[PDB]
């Protein structure tokens, strides 16, 4: 009775929550550059996830204490009547860390809040983390960052989506936002409501990888290709078909 | 005109090569245990990949020099007439490394041989690495290893398939072989020729994660669940439809 086309049950009362932690500026003593264009990423994601039925909650430039407080709140609330959970980090990072305004936080302690034991109401439901984070260097310009955040998985029924893999480069337009987020949001717009979500992330991999880097205004940006990846521990096909209003 | 259902071109003369590096025993001074049951993994993979049209080349207990020589040979040969490339490591590992018989090798130097620049004849073609490697701890029994190998991606058009993620445990039956390889090989057998390959790996994630660990013969094995993962940098849908 094992079914090769089994779908996650996506017929709960609510789609669920999408958190977006948006980080544009950092405490002076961290000496991290501003992420001009991140607000376009935040707004584009808010529209696309909202249109798929998510209750989107955005937070701008939280300090570590506030960020840990919000994400613990969301993890200890009931998801019993929700299909799934989405969490987005738009920041700088290094290895297994993301930067809040004032300090780095271990990604595993954030994903850990939504694992089986700690969040019973999300057991067997998709938990999707999207991470646009790279190394902070030091009218619509393209800024380019080295990959820095480990493309780690997170546990049963987690999907971890990364803007860039080791040895590649992350691009952000200061007005239009991140290449990865622009291409993710275009694909959510056209295909989010019909295509299997990993099939859609594969389109994003193609779109981002096909962006040409041979004729760049800045000569030092030439050859710096971007290739995203995703680490799936999903156990079923994931669709975001339109819900009953 | 951008196509949301675009498939990798899988209509070349040959499917391509599948390498399987099978490591059962290790140099005494490494203090690594034998991997009893790995030969079942090697044989099960050989049958399933052969049935999908791969030219399977197996190597048993190569030392670092021999392993680097074989994999460099395969990387510098023409893949122009091939659909794709598969490479399987059945060994112990730690972090960024896999064990040959005598020493550890950086996984990135092995995958790096098949990247764009270094292997022009595989550009735009799927490069699939399958890694059954965990920490060597010091009739058909179940041995259990802590996850140890980083679940890293490689580059454009690579798919990296891992038996186990951080915090989970890898299981091997000393006769029937690894849980991950048994479930992978069952799914290749039933669905390899019809299903999209990442869809099939998702079935393997479910099969392996549903294997119960509450009533184990060894009490210290209770609660040690196994969850695999894959890191995709594929740009299109990957199918292994029967060739003609
Ligand atoms: O994936 C990236 C991305 C990068 F930007 C730079 C390096 C890597 C590869 N490292 C890993 N990838 C997956 C899981 C764990 C690690 C890891 C953990 C601890 C120490 C080293 N690596």
Swiss-Prot record, chain A:
One example of a Gene Ontology biological process annotation: regulation of programmed cell death
Reactions listed under catalytic activity: Strict requirement for Asp at position P1 and has a preferred cleavage sequence of Val-Glu-His-Asp-|-
Subcellular location: Cytoplasm; Nucleus
Note on domains (UniProt): The N-terminal disordered prodomain is required to prevent self-activation.
Any one Gene Ontology cellular component term annotated for this protein: cytoplasm
Summary of the function given for this chain in its UniProt record: Cysteine protease that plays essential roles in programmed cell death, axonal degeneration, development and innate immunity. Acts as a non-canonical executioner caspase during apoptosis: localizes in the nucleus and cleaves the nuclear structural protein NUMA1 and lamin A/LMNA thereby inducing nuclear shrinkage and fragmentation. Lamin-A/LMNA cleavage is required for chromatin condensation and nuclear disassembly during apoptotic execution.
Effect of residue 209 to E: Phospho-mimetic mutant; loss of self-activation
SMART domains according to UniProt: CASc
Known regulation of activity: During activation, the N-terminal disordered prodomain is removed by cleavage. Concomitantly, double cleavage gives rise to a large 18-kDa and a small 11-kDa subunit. The two large and two small subunits then assemble to form the active CASP6 complex. Can be cleaved and activated by different caspases, depending on the context. Cleaved and activated by caspase-8 (CASP8) and subsequently by caspase-3 (CASP3).
Gene: CASP6
InterPro entries: Caspase-like_dom_sf, Caspase_cys_AS, Caspase_his_AS, Pept_C14, Pept_C14_caspase, Pept_C14_p10, Pept_C14_p20, Pept_C14A
Modified residues (Phosphoserine): 50, 209
Family membership noted in the UniProt record: Belongs to the peptidase C14A family.
Entry comment on modification after translation: Phosphorylated by NUAK1; phosphorylation inhibits self-activation. Phosphorylation at Ser-209 by AMP-activated protein kinase (PRKAA1 or PRKAA2) inhibits autocleavage, preventing caspase activation, thereby preventing hepatocyte apoptosis. Palmitoylation by ZDHHC17 blocks dimerization and subsequent activation, leading to inhibit the cysteine protease activity.
Region (130's region): 96-113
Name of this chain's protein: Caspase-6
Residue ranges the record marks as coiled coil: none
Tree of life domain: Eukaryota
